[PDB]
Ligand binder design. Structure first.
Ligand SMILES: *C(=O)[C@H](C[C@@H]1CCNC1=O)NC(=O)[C@H](CC(C)C)NC(=O)OC[C@@H]1C[C@H]1c1ccccc1
Ligand SMILES: *C(=O)[C@H](C[C@@H]1CCNC1=O)NC(=O)[C@H](CC(C)C)NC(=O)OC[C@@H]1C[C@H]1c1ccccc1
Lengths: 295, 301
């Protein structure tokens, strides 16, 4: 059992290089539109507190250089939607997949195709935290990298990268330019809330382990929802609902471990602390969906 | 800092489905050849101890169903090379990347494109353990999935998946059909040796942590290759050579922390544990990043 990204070929086809002044970053070319963070129009000074409306007024279509390999695309329109720029280009991406824009929920996962200069460097899987940050690997030039899931041949884009916070975690927008969490695209110190642990994911992981041999944490003891949720309240785990139980229903079936048998194992691991799938810590960034896909 | 696979696009376009009998697995289609594990030609009873020569003799081209997307590729020939089967096909993959076949060294890493029925489902990063196994995620039907690196525009194919060992680790071959390690493609309990921890990679990871702000484990001490190696041997860490030191040179230069200083820090961590702290978020020492891995990621190649 491994943390696993989606095959990223479908997204690589959409990545382009967008340049404006001395600023360059990555764009998402879908049909005849390139999506990219709006702070591409910003200079050094401007970054501390830009007026994007006024700054955009100062830029014409020709100030934007969209590059797809050894091919320049002509920009012919531009519009600001929230924190993203939509540049209309004269050419439609032949490699446009079937795609949709979604806004995922915290606790959901997606893959990230980290890019630089419109070229992909690597791929990894992230979770959206309850405080609407992600733990990534992004350097300067990586803005415009996107997060996505693949259901069938449909690419669901859900994230576009804009910034690092002083803690070193990351923040960005959906593809309509709306930030996840309270953040603004300005170079100021910004706090994320206190985080918490995605209980439903820890359970699915404990299922993943069982399915893959690790079984030492199981026990004869059992527990109720209301009982488990006092323990969880104390260790800063999200409370478990009947909706979460039902979500875990399918892994319960494959294993014959009732959800609340597994919650008993988790109460005990929480109160008393070997390894589980070779981790010394409880992993909370696999969803039930992820666990079922990989088993 | 993250465990990060190469982008897999160039490889997805080479994955096909190969079926022979009730047995389906994945093949790698490059130019006009499809490469896959040879046990695709086995049934149930054959698995326990097959004579692959005899079994391949009794099979013909029409016995191999190769599907690529929604297109059926006509097989027009079949040879065996070591533990892999080469199926010549009527059409050449128009999506054949520039590629090479390499046999990687233990301690080196590579990306795995996990596939089922010729369809990619996922991608992750692995190391060739010193005992020539890999800790992967492989189910039935995943055989023929490949591991690879990208250097330049060239895909270097280094691994093709064959089997799971009793302990749960995985074993396979290079793309010429030679297994990494002492393993055979037969349904029998098979031992890998005792595994060791890849010391030069652990050091590479400690550099990655310093680069990313995690510094509590640095100390003012230093050591010698010889004095460190006597500790390494005790905790089943590969011994460090002057070659490993020079490989770590570039990361030494960027952090201005001397290799043997970091070895002093590793020494302390092994003898004292992590005292409850973490490092790059981990409660254990990671050994599946090469120095090359850390540099590619901490500089954006
Ligand atoms: C993409 O253009 C880039 C990616 C950043 C680069 C460093 N790591 C990353 O993920 N984005 C930016 O540089 C941001 C542009 C603004 C928001 C329009 N700015 C940014 O990320 O600044 C880094 C964090 C804010 C600074 C900070 C730390 C500690 C105390 C105060 C401020
Ligand atoms: C790919 O077709 C498949 C992938 C395996 C299946 C389960 N997990 C995997 O990675 N390969 C095979 O099934 C192998 C074909 C043989 C070599 C002809 N066989 C295999 O993987 O056996 C599973 C483990 C070895 C058996 C075992 C355990 C304990 C004691 C004795 C034997």
């Amino acid at each position: 059992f491994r943390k696993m990204a989606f095959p990223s070929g479908k997204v690589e086809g959409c990545m382009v290089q967008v340049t404006c002044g001395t600023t360059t970053l990555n764009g998402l070319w879908l049909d005849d539109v390139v999506y990219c963070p709006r702070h591409v129009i910003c200079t050094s000074e401007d970054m501390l507190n830009p007026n994007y409306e006024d700054l955009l007024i100062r830029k014409s279509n020709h100030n934007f250089l969209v590059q797809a390999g050894n091919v320049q695309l002509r920009v012919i329109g531009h519009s600001m939607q929230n924190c993203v720029l939509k540049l209309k280009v004269d050419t439609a991406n032949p490699k446009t997949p079937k795609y949709k824009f979604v806004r995922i929920q915290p606790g959901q996962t997606f893959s990230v195709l980290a890019c630089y200069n419109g070229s992909p460097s690597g791929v990894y899987q992230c979770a959206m935290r309850p405080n609407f940050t992600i733990k990534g690997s992004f350097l300067n030039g990586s803005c415009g990298s996107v997060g996505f899931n693949i259901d069938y041949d449909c690419v669901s884009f859900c994230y576009m990268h804009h910034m690092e916070l002083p803690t070193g975690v990351h923040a960005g927008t959906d593809l309509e330019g709306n930030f996840y969490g309270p953040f603004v695209d300005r170079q100021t110190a910004q706090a994320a809330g206190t985080d918490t642990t995605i209980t439903v994911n820890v359970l699915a992981w404990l299922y993943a382990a069982v399915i893959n041999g690790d079984r030492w944490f199981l026990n004869r003891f059992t527990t109720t929802l209301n009982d488990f949720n006092l323990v969880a309240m104390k260790y800063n785990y999200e409370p478990l609902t009947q909706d979460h139980v039902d979500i875990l229903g399918p892994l319960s079936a494959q294993t014959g471990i009732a959800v609340l048998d597994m919650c008993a194992s988790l109460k005990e691991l929480l109160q008393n602390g070997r390894t589980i799938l070779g981790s010394a810590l409880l992993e909370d960034e696999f969803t039930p969906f992820d666990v079922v896909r990989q088993c």
